[PDB]
Amino acid sequence: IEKERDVILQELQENDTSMRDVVFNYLHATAFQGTPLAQSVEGPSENVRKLSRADLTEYLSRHYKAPRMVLAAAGGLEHRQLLDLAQKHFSGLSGTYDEDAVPTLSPCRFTGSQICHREDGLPLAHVAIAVEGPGWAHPDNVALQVANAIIGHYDCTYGG
Amino acid sequence: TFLRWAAEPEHDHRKRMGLKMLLMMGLLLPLVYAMKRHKWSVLKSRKLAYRPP
Numbered sequence: 001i002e003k004e005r006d007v008i009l010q011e012l013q014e015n016d017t018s019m020r021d022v023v024f025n026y027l028h029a030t031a032f033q034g035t036p037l038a039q040s041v042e043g044p045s046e047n048v049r050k051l052s053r054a055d056l057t058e059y060l061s062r063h064y065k066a067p068r069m070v071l072a073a074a075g076g077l078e079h080r081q082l083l084d085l086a087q088k089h090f091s092g093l094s095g096t097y098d099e100d101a102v103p104t105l106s107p108c109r110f111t112g113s114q115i116c117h118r119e120d121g122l123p124l125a126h127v128a129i130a131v132e133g134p135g136w137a138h139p140d141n142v143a144l145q146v147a148n149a150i151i152g153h154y155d156c157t158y159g160g
Numbered sequence: 161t162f163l164r165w166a167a168e169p170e171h172d173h174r175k176r177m178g179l180k181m182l183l184m185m186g187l188l189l190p191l192v193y194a195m196k197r198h199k200w201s202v203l204k205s206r207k208l209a210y211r212p213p
Contacts, residue, residue, distance in 0.1 A: 001053060008048050015042070022117075023128045030115045031130065035108040062101060066093040 015021055029038045042048075071090065073082055110132040134140055164171065197204070 001051075005048060005051070008042065009045055012042065012045055012048070019122070019124075019126045023126045026115050026117065027128050027130065030113040031110055031132070032108050033111055033113065037108050061094075062103075064093075065097055065102065066090070066095045068102070069093075 025040050028040075032038045071082070071086060134144075168174075
């Protein structure tokens with residue numbers, strides 16, 4: 001726990017240079033202010049320093065429940081083979097939980113905003129603009145994937 | 161009273177426009193003052209910070 005604590009602080013210093021990852025993390029911070037989605041997967045370096053074994057056992061004992069989870073596979077196997085192992089191994093999971101142990105997700109507050117981290121020392125300028133999206137299950141996701149695809153994408157290596 | 165009409169026959173028509181004005185200007189001044197503090201609102205509410213290495 002203490003080794004990887006030092007490692008992850010070293011990773012953040014590396015991800016401070018991955019300018020792309022920074023923008024999206026800044027982006028979610030502003031679109032989704034005051035909500036969890038503003039957070040990063042990695043979280044602040046403070047919590048990385050101020051963490052405990054107890055915080056994790058809480059996190060694991062709360063979220064990792066069979067109903068919220070999925071086993072799945074693909075390739076040269078059979079479904080029936082997978083079941084005999086699931087019952088063999090995964091029958092032992094906590095398939096239940098207390099009256100209010102598992103949280104639920106409310107909608108999150110999108111907002112219109114801007115963040116402008118000025119750094120002239122660096123030679124190039126990453127930008128990211130976006131809006132509120134439908135969600136996964138909303139059917140108009142299909143039409144939008146076309147609309148983005150009309151615009152497409154580009155690098156300076158494409159020979160067209 | 162007659163001479164004031166002679167030297168200023170526009171008097172009676174002057175004020176009617178004076179009335180139309182203040183009612184319009186009573187409206188446009190706050191409304192424009194809103195669009196101002198609508199567009200400048202970005203700047204009256206922005207924030208700053210200083211994150212050196």
